[PDB]
């Protein structure tokens, strides 16, 4: 029953809403539980980093097209280029994704370099101490400062392009002959008439023959 100048209300409160209300009084209690689980997990993995390596990926929509972020895993072609066996990759902290493809060459080159330098920073202890092997560390450089996050030490360096650039005068280019505004209008109407123009031209060829 409206009485004055009001905004028309729409409050979805006619079911039995009181039976399903979820108050959050355990927000600080839950936080303590997670911190106890992380430090417990870090103790089990004594020299290993907690996280796993991820590749660089671009967002899939025209909006957010500019920014980049972390993905799920490296494609099978990226691993082959860097000379890493498929089966050995998951067991040394590398994450693999078998359902992604490299359509372009810009993305392929960026990820290969990001994965190649990780292999140089890796220290690999031998399976049995008394008998080391060829690919193992020769025990001389096993003592060095290590990292444990691997998400901050290997995060995205810069997601967006630089804000601006400064260039000397007389280097500024010349625009399109017609202009910027007219280049868009011509390109829009060309796609609208792509069908009408093609058939009109084509039927003329059979008409003359």
């Amino acid at each position: 029953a409206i009485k004055h100048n009001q905004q028309i209300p729409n409050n979805h409160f006619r079911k039995h809403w009181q039976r399903r209300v979820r108050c959050h009084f355990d927000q600080p209690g839950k936080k303590v539980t997670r911190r106890l689980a992380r430090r417990a997990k870090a103790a089990a993995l004594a020299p290993r980093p907690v996280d796993k390596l991820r590749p660089i990926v671009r967002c899939p929509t025209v909006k957010y097209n500019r920014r980049t972020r972390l993905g799920r895993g490296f494609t099978l072609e990226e691993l082959k280029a860097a000379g890493i066996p498929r089966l050995l990759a998951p067991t040394i902290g590398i994450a693999v994704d078998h359902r992604r493809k490299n359509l372009s060459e810009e993305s392929l080159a960026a990820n290969v370099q990001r994965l190649k330098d990780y292999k140089a920073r890796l220290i690999l202890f031998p399976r049995k101490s008394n008998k080391p092997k060829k690919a193992d560390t020769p025990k001389d450089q096993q003592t060095a400062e290590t990292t444990t996050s691997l998400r901050t030490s290997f995060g995205v360096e810069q997601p967006l392009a630089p804000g601006f650039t400064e260039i000397s005068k007389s280097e500024i280019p010349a625009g399109i002959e017609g202009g910027a505004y007219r280049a868009l209008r011509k390109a829009r109407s060309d796609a609208r008439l792509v069908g009408v123009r093609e058939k009109r031209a084509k039927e003329k060829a059979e008409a003359e023959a």
């Binding site: 029953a1 392009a161 601006f164 625009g175 910027a180």
Partner: protein
Amino acid sequence: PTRFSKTRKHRGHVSAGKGRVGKHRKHPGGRGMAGGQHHHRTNLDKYHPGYFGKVGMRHFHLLRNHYWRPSINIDKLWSLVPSDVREQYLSGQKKDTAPVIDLLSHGYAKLLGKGRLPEIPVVVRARYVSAEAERKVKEAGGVVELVA
């Protein structure tokens, strides 16, 4: 705080400020928007003119990402360059170098033109540009180039 509210001042006065003849019954007039066309029409036409009816054609499965293009006027263009570099250009110490502004990196797609521009050449890279905005930037010595 309930210690200071009008319900505390009503103690000792029968009917609690709701009147004697009209006794504040349960639901006179109906619940919600009842009577929109019958007995609440007078209120619903003095205010809210246009509640009833159909207008326009419908769109199935609209995705709002296809229609993303925020716009920026031309008089705010110089605010994009950092302050330290900005004062050098306006004061007039460079005299041989021009800035290249990337609208997409700041979150814009269309460059509208509304105000005035000082006479310093610039380079603007935008996805869209208006007809009036292209002229003003061009007569200042600059150029606009589409970037996609």
